[PDB]
């Protein structure tokens, strides 16, 4: 149960999509900041050979991809690779790559490909996705997949993020080699290429959990039929198989009228309009449905609404 919030023509997030080939920067070996179109890339590295504290490091660009260049590590200090190392004071830490999108930009999916990490020695790591400084999604990966020509590192779970942290995790070993061999080869920001958004609406499903705590929120879809563009064409809401967090509103000429993007971890929902609509039947809002599952599994059905742009 949630009241409609009108969409608006201002402060619309720029949506970032497209595949970015991170092997095309080797001309400058070492930058503190890589600057591509829509995002920047930084790096955090070890404070010394015997200090696991993270400090600003250089992004190291090569024909294989990007890695982090710590001045010193306790062993196997690789310049072109993101490294997890143990330190003899008895604690461990990983180098970091940081993908930071430009202000007012968001992605709803990522497909990340690494290099220098398959072919024998166990290699593992994790990608964290943040939106506004909340954790939104993690993706863990490992050279137990099926070779350097194997993606499956997908994240259309949660939609919105503005920040990726890519780091290594512990592979199990002790002092010669650990998770190192891991170099970011490409990053593809998922989503269909749309027109230019003429309106935007955002709210957050925040519901009563009770005393048994939080579990998860789910995007049911949308009941709405009879929705029409202001030119009078019928609208058909739909998902792709396996991707409950993106509803497309298409117009029966095939064109996109709106998209809804949902972020389950925070409950955030974001409405993008591309064509003016006719006043939605009955109420005047587009009603989407949610199921608020529990830590047990104790369920509760509700809804969030938004009034679209209507000439
Ligand atoms: Ca390194
Ligand atoms: Ca290694
Ligand atoms: Ca309603
Ligand atoms: Ca409605
Ligand atoms: Ca309960």
TrEMBL record:
This is RTX protein.
